[model samples]
Target: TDPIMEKLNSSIAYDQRLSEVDIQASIAYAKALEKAGILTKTELEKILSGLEKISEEWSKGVFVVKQSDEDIHTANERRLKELIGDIAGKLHTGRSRNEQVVTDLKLFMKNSLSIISTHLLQLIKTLVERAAIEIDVILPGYTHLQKAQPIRWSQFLLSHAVALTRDSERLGEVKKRINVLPLGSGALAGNPLDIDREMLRSELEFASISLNSMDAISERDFVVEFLSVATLLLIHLSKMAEDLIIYSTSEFGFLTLSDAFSTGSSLMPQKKNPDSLELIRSKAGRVFGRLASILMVLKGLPSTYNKDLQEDKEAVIDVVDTLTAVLQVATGVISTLQISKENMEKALTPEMLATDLALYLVRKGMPFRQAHTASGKAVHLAETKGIAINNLTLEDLKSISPLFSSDVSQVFNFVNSVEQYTALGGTAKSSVTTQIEQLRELMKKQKEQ
Candidate 1:
């Protein structure tokens, strides 16, 4: 292996997607340089055009970088010089690689949030569609991986939708923090030129300019924040993926992996495995590790940029790619997975219903202790006879407690059990419908933002 070359190679190997962010920031840089009187109007136009052309080429997969290039910034600058001659060098006026890279990374993060949010919206919509289809279907809810209660599959999916909303909100907050222009921060201090930071901010769509010069040029927190958001979002996705893997298995049988998102084993005749979901789940670890690594890289670094800061790029890129892939594939998985309502109906058995029934009696003016004891006795009676709670005879229920009447036995039903949770945000049809409607409106507002 080429040791020295490996030692010096840029993280752009993983962060090529920064090409668009870099180009966007460069367009703003050209305007900044123009206002600084560092570049003529003609020169600014040439640089902007060159930057746009390079961006287009990269988007189309036609852009090429030389092996010796340090990173996307250097590589693009060299290419700009080639396209527009020496005036391209003027594009760097009043700015340095330190601020430039951070600005590019910020732009990349802001844009990535938009892309991720849009994809998440699609996935959330898929989940809502699935929820509507699975509203009556039941599934076992778990705590510590043990059965805890029976929930409508629609309710379970709505829970994930709520989590996605939180993730989207977190990204929105990160974007707010990232909407600061850092271009005039120069190498490690504010540039001496009278650069028009506002013009750059306007050109780049930033809401504000960086507050402090040293912090602006030197800080990597914005990148860290983006990585943090990506890490958290990926973790949520992994949790969802884990649930899907479990549910799609024969053991749970709550769902079936669509063959499109699954793979058959070579050696096992009956293995239609959820390989895509498994990989998406596994990649979350990589994203988390990247976030941790970036934090460690910055833990005690002094004010101003350091060579150590070069380590930030790979983490950001890794997270972006992993999360984008997860969101995209997860959207498909949610949209296409074959939910097994019959299997779910079986899975949501008397064991799942026991707690709801226990809670139900408490709602009827019985003290919780009495209600729980009665439910426990009923469960033991059914377990002894290998019968379901719904199969209990009125006499069998009366044997546990005189509180159990024929009327009480008549009310023991699956739909009634689910519908009894009539409070706000419950699994009841009215509550879930309200939640779905409110979420749809909130998600629409999030998209418009």
Candidate 2:
């Protein structure tokens, strides 16, 4: 082999992370080999014991890398041969590095997903808990980055929680595909050893075994799915982080991040920066890059496995670690942040109720189009006179439209305007309370499942 080629092709640097899963898949393959009459009982015992010792060296960080070891499979086999002599050679009797690597990858994904999913679930739970606590807290909801209407703080928090909850649901959807075993698909054809794939799949707890050997070795859809879900999850986190960052600004002054999650500026004497959220916001780009990079690696490949697939581990490993850290930070931010109710209330200007003013005319038997024009006139009247729309006298309102009545004063009450939105999924008190209950039940069922 060319030295330059070795330098270009080695994956031991990062694929070493798969050391344990490689051992796990190897043990299952060994059991299948023994059952196929390819290995004696004594050989099976030696191989299992050797794999156990190899796993120990890996776990203790004592697994030495060899100059010839190009990837995790080679390194572990080399070490196993050293420990148990020729018996380690039988372990690979029916398996190829192609199937071996994906087996390890799938195993790692299955285990890692469980952990990532739990972290995501915890974040969802935290959001719901925070929303319940801040249920009645009202804030200005925005559209196009401008204050549009009044909404409960809980409703805003629940919106992000629902996105994350869907992210967690997507994890389950992808894991069903990820949990399929790619072993027993020797290289590009069916296994020659006639190993019992069903027994092997059962041993590894795979939901099912791969159907086509050629497709099996080349299939990276599972990895792509995992990364895609992670990309979306990080995107949601980035949006949430952006909200917290904006709210923490002195201009917005809606909330303050906990000091533990914040930082002070060096030059600005009064500065408290949301560095945790800023990092969460920025790291999303890294995840997006990874998702895009892997798609490029897999795009033009021919049938079966290729050297290009080696590019997969680094991207997936980074996404898993990045998303895990971001989820934890998000949970911390949601739990520890303090909302300034006074600031939120102060930010809700009487102009936000302009829609309610139109709705008031609609309730009074005016066509919506005519009502909309009348509301616009009221807004224009307020702007020309330099007073809040609510400050316009009844005569001033009647001048714009005869629909104006004493009850039109109710339009100015932000809480009443919000409560008037009593339809399903509305921001009304009952609607939000019902939403919280439904979310709790949804989370409960997800937990049970």
Candidate 3:
């Protein structure tokens, strides 16, 4: 082999992260071989001892690598042979690198997603807790960059929280599929030594066993699924980050990021930018690229094992690292940020209650279409006189329609306008309280699981 080719093809630098799982899967394989009568009890004991010693060396940071040790599996086997002689060679009797690598990838994914779910839930819990505390704080909700209605601050926060809650649920559903065993598939055909793959599955604590060797050795759908989940998760975080960046600005001033999460500008003397959020927004694109790159690598591969599958490890590694960091930052931002209730209240202009004005006319024996047209005329009159909708006198309102009574004065109250929307999922105080309770229930179930 050419030296340049070796340099180009080697995965030891990155794939060596799987050393622990590689040892784990190998120990299970060794036990299965002994169960099949291929190894005596004495040889089994030696193999187990050697594998344990290798794991100890790795954990202690004393494991050394040789030039020819191409991957985690190769390095461990080299060390195993040196430690236990030729009996260590029997460890690979019914396995091949094709099945071995995929098994390690699945094991690593299953383990990683477990921890990632906790971070994701913590971020959701922070959002929910903040929402519960800020239930009375009302802000102008927006559509098309214009103030649309008055909603509780908690309702706005729960909108993002519900999305992340679904993301955590998606992770749970995918984990079951990721826990299946592929180790007994042995290259491209079933294991030839009559090895009990069921025993191997039990020994490894896999949720189930693979159904086909050809597909098992080559399939990378589980990795793709994980990256897809990570991509969506980052996209959700990015949107929330964009909101924080915009709201933390001097122009909006609805919220202030904690000083610890903000950074001063190098060139501007009076600027404290939300750089943590900016980075969270930017890292989303990186994870998206990693997802697409892996999909391209898998798009045209042949049926069984191929070298292209090696591309999966790095992409998955990048996604996991990116999501973990993004979740931590997102949690910290929610926990430390301060909500400006005065700024939020000041943003709630009476013009936002136009819908309530229209509905008020509807309640007084007028068709909604005519009521909507009359409400628009009221707004037009207020705009013509350079006044707020509430500032229009009862005479101005009556001219739009006789349906406008002295009671019309009541529609302009922001709190009254918000409380009138009492339907389920509406932004009423009771509705938001119900949502918070429901969210707590959902989070409880997530933890118990």
Candidate 4:
């Protein structure tokens, strides 16, 4: 027989990443085997001890992979066979390759997402810490990349941070489903060993057991949810990185990327490119591609386990790895960023405070819409006269509207401009402080969760 199909059949390439989870599930199954009277007391100990021995090998980096190691399940079982003789076969007496694979994946995702939550919350904390300390830093807040108003620098940071607050909870929801047990489900049928699934659930720490075997083995929705959660997180990640990249540019000069997170150009000696964020921005497509590929493989598939389900592992595994790295890099970027208060101040043009100029007329009993028109005419007068809006003489302002007065000078103050946004969720200093406090509270609750 030809051996080339073996290449097509192999998952050992990446399923080896599941080695530990597969080992953990095997240990639980051995106990389940003992409970079912399939493995005697001596056999259980030998198997448990042998699995522990295998665990030690993996933990210490001595577990070797061979050409015949087709998948994680077979590889572990093959090793168990060598360690404890014929008793090894008894462990899978009523088990299916199908359930073992799904159980391993669920357990892997369950444990993996907990670690991810920690990294994600750590990132949120970095952003919040910077926000609290830099709440006074004001910059030109933009709409459509055009200066619309003045806003605290912290307000921009919190915008991205708040988007991820939903992501942290989305991870919780995905993990909730990932914690369901699939061990007692057989190959498209219920187990025959009188398998006490409730006991299995408790041993493995699954929240509940799957109701139907056929559905359990093929339910890649958890994989979908996990990848989808990552996709959403990375979308936020890409936008934040892009914003920082633009800020780090010489033209914006709003912030400098830390040397620790940046790289030099090969030929451009003056270049300190934001390659760190550039990668985070580009790697978003990597996670996105994986998510799309898995869903494509899942669409219109028949019931029960199929070769298509095998594709879910690399997608889920790679996303966890990618998301973890992206979160950490993003944290580092926020923590080490250096601000150029001078550049930010200079970038705040007089036009940015035009909205405040309009509101000033409204405060003087002018109708809001008419005040807006008056403010626009004043702006045009300044433009035509080739002078700053604040430089417009009071006579010129009064010619536009009777609401014009010497008090209009107050509207030119950048600090006053940003501070007026005092409503909740605004960019005002008080509002930015409240945003930090609220996110910190959410961080605490997430820690307990």
Candidate 2, superposed: residue stretches over 4 Å from native: 266-269
Model 1, 1-449: lDDT tens digits are 58686647556576677888888888887887887788889888888889999999899999898876668888888888888898888777667888887888888877877787888788888888788776777777789989777678899899998888888888888888888888888887688797888888889898999998889977888778888878788788888988999888888877787888899867985667999999988887898788889889998998777888888877777677777878889999888888777887776566666776677677678898889888998889998889877888888888877666666753456777778778998888888888888889888888787
Worst 10 residues of 4 by lDDT: 263-272
TM-score of each: 0.91, 0.96, 0.96, 0.97
**Per-residue CA lDDT of candidate 2, range 1-449, in tens?**
89998898888998888999999899999998989999999999999999999999889999899888988988998888998898788888867888887888889889899888788988998998888888878989988889999998888998998898888789889999998888999988979978899999999999999999999999899888899999998899999988889999999999988888999966985668999999999988999999899899999888778978978888888888888888888889889988899999899889899998999999889998999999999999999999988999999999988889898888898888789878988888888888778887877777664
lDDT of 4 by residue, 1-449 (tens): 36898788899889888888888888888898888888889999999999988888877879887888889888888888898898889888888889988999889898889989989998998888888888888888877887888888999999999999989989888888888999989888889888889988998899999988989988899998888889889999999988898889998999998888998867976567898999999888998899899889989999978987888888888888998888999999999988999999899898877789999988889898998898899899999999999989998998998777778788889889988889999988889888888998887887776
CA error at residue 373 for candidate 1, angstroms: 2.4
**Who is ahead in lDDT, 1 or 4?**
4
In angstroms, the error of model 4 at 211 is 2.0
Which residue window of length 10 is worst by lDDT in model 3? 264-273
Candidate 3 on 318-433: residue-level lDDT in tens?
Answer: 78878888899899999999878999999999788889999998998889899899889898899899998998999888888988888888898888988987898888988888
Count backbone clashes in candidate 2: 0
Ordering by TM-score = 4, 3, 2, 1
